[PDB]
A paper describes a structure:
Here we show that in addition to small-molecule antibiotics, Streptomyces produce and secrete antibacterial protein complexes that feature a large, degenerate repeat-containing polymorphic toxin protein. A cryo-electron microscopy structure of these particles reveals an extended stalk topped by a ringed crown comprising the toxin repeats scaffolding five lectin-tipped spokes, which led us to name them umbrella particles. Streptomyces coelicolor encodes three umbrella particles with distinct toxin and lectin composition. Each contains an amino-terminal twin arginine translocation (TAT) signal, two sets of four ALF repeats (ALF1–ALF8), two extended coiled-coil domains, and variable C-terminal and toxin domains.
Author numbering:
A (entry chain A): 99 to 197
B (entry chain C): 30 to 287, 292 to 297, 307 to 323, 332 to 351, 356 to 369, 371 to 385, 395 to 405, 408 to 417, ...
C (entry chain B): 42 to 166
């Protein structure tokens, strides 16, 4: 069952997770369980930091500041930004940029 | 070297040198206004084999900064290195700068080796315990553990090891405010350094060589344009008659017989006139135990053409007068029955007073022919039993080149 | 037997750093040091290899250090412009000029998306 979920990761996640998943799958079940218990937390630093960095580099003042602050924070803050915080910042940036 | 930073004008004779853009870096210190002393290994392709570091120009452009205790300011002097003169036996090289630095004094050299237990200090621009490259130079403290064949073994006191970039750095010992250079850092355990770790603080340094430096720094005092003011005497209590001569600087320099150079008017005559054991140089300059002449005094209370030395009853001068007569002085005596005097020279124990005829013939007086040919016409101020300034003003001995080239 | 105390400008302790942080260092002019990231940050580099990130401290200007960090993506600057050289997987190198007191990215988080390597970190001066 763990191989199936990991197999999905290998085809849906970022490059960091995909490389980790397309390794753990062909591995003793005991280690695969560990991967799907805590090992799969590593992408929070590998893929999420890249994604937020891209948003900062090509974004306006609103996104740049909000993203930058999350980037220097913890995993929960980065995850939140890339889920809802990014949209709030982008809309507000557009609002003031247009006005 | 791990210790307090220092920018005081006691150790401002130190230097930092770099070879190439970033190829190598090490430390050094001044011995003259034109010369800087460092390790030979800095200029080697393999620093552990400083045998191929030949004399001549640096393989790569080399620069040195002198007196710049603090690298963030322009204070100090910058000079290019033009020539290297390696030590024939050990890891030590003298670097010649293109231009002198007259503002910063050199450090005096030690006369002997420090013994075990002696508290020595050291300064350099090498690594510290927490910095790869320092902003300011630092001073440490070391003690002698032993002395070996041309080298001194030291250890750090309370830590403070010799590290990296300290190669070429001086080892110093002072007394009553006077600093002497006792050796130069070569190798170390490098304990307590940034980026590395080991317990040992031991290090080895080359022993300072005063004679090596003297014969390099003063290597060219003569051999060029010299005056005819030359005289012979024993100035080093060696039993070998030395030669003193006046250079274009108006000073009298002593060259020791083995001619090796020492460290320190119409006609000049020498000899031990008062039998004091120290050769002297109408006023008499008395010799001293240090090889330095004292203040002269009149030997008496202008129509003489030449005056040269002559030993009378074991102790004297002979003067050739414009009337052709020659007299000896202690009380004076007639040296020759008539006015038959010819270029006057000094004496030598051939078996005797030497002389040169206007026809170029050389002879001696007990006259008898002294030289097979007649080529002494252009010779001046002949001194003494071996015996001219030469047509090139280069002293020859009878004609071996006693002077270096 | 003791080594010669001669500076070859090879980064001190580089062998240990490779083992512990995953980053490797070569030669520099000695005015940049690797340090911890705890309120002492000056120039900070982020990657997805080794111990995730690390900081460097500028002692004097100008300064440079030819360090190598695979899969780099982000750089932080402070009180100074930073000139950075990166290289692609095909061996082609390019230079990115980062402004002071801001954050920029590289290939991976840049315009190409390429997994580039950090080649040269140079401090203006």
């Amino acid at each position: 069952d763990n191989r199936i979920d990991a197999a999905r990761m290998a085809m849906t996640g970022g490059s960091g997770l995909r490389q980790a998943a397309k390794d753990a799958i062909r591995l003793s079940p005991a280690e695969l369980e560990k991967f799907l218990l805590y090992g799969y937390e590593e992408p929070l630093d590998d893929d999420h930091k890249v994604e937020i960095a891209r948003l900062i580099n090509l974004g306006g003042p609103g996104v740049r500041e909000a993203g930058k602050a999350a980037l220097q924070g913890t995993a929960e803050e980065r995850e939140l930004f890339l889920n809802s915080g990014q949209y709030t910042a982008q809309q507000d940036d557009n609002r003031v940029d247009v006005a | 070297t791990v210790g307090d930073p220092t920018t005081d004008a006691k150790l401002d004779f130190t230097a930092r040198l770099t070879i190439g853009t970033d190829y190598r870096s090490c430390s050094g210190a001044l011995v003259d206004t034109q010369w800087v002393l460092t390790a030979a290994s800095c200029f080697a392709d393999d620093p552990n084999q400083p045998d191929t570091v030949a004399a001549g120009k640096p393989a790569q452009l080399t620069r040195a900064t002198v007196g710049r205790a603090d690298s963030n300011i322009a204070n100090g002097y910058v000079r290019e290195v033009v020539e290297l003169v390696p030590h024939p036996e050990r890891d030590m090289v003298l670097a010649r700068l293109d231009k002198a630095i007259p503002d910063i004094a050199p450090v005096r050299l030690a006369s002997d080796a420090p013994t075990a237990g002696t508290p020595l200090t050291a300064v350099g621009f090498g690594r510290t315990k927490d910095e790869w490259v320092p902003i300011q130079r630092h001073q440490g403290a070391f003690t002698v553990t032993s002395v070996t064949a041309g080298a001194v073994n030291v250890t750090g006191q309370g830590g403070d090891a010799i590290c990296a970039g300290d190669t070429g750095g001086p080892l110093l010992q002072d007394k009553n405010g006077t600093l002497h250079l006792v050796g130069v850092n070569n190798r170390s355990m490098q304990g307590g350094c940034y980026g590395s770790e080991t317990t040992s603080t031991d290090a080895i340094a080359a022993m300072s060589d005063a004679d090596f430096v003297t014969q390099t720094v003063n290597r060219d005092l003569g051999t060029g344009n010299l005056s005819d003011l030359v005289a012979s005497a024993d100035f080093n209590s060696d039993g070998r008659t030395d030669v003193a001569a006046v250079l274009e600087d108006g000073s009298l320099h002593a060259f020791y017989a083995k001619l090796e150079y020492g460290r320190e008017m119409v006609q000049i005559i020498g000899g031990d006139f008062n039998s004091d054991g120290n050769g002297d140089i109408l006023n008499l300059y008395t010799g001293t135990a240090t090889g330095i002449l004292n203040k002269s005094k009149p030997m008496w209370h202008k129509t003489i053409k030449q005056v040269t030395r002559f030993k009378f009853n074991g102790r004297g001068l002979v003067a050739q007068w414009g009337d052709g007569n020659l007299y000896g002085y202690y009380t004076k005596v007639k040296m020759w029955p008539d006015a038959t005097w010819t270029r006057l020279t000094g004496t030598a124990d051939i078996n005797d007073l030497t002389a040169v005829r206007d026809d170029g013939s050389l002879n001696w007086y007990a006259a008898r022919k002294l030289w097979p040919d007649n080529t002494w016409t252009p010779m001046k101020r002949i001194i003494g039993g071996d015996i001219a300034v030469g047509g090139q003003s280069t002293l020859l001995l009878y004609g071996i080149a006693m002077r270096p080239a | 037997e003791m080594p010669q105390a001669v500076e070859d400008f090879s980064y001190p302790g580089a062998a240990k750093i490779q083992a512990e942080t995953g980053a490797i260092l070569k030669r520099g002019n000695g005015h940049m040091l690797m340090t911890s990231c705890d309120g002492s940050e000056d120039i900070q580099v982020m990657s997805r290899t080794g111990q995730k990130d690390f900081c460097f401290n500028v002692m004097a200007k100008p300064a440079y250090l030819t360090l190598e960090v695979p899969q780099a993506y982000g750089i932080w600057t402070s009180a100074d412009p930073v000139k950075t050289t990166i290289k692609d997987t095909d061996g082609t190198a390019t230079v990115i000029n980062a402004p002071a007191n801001d954050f920029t990215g590289y290939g991976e988080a840049g315009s190409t998306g390429e997994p580039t390597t950090l080649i040269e970190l140079r401090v203006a001066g």
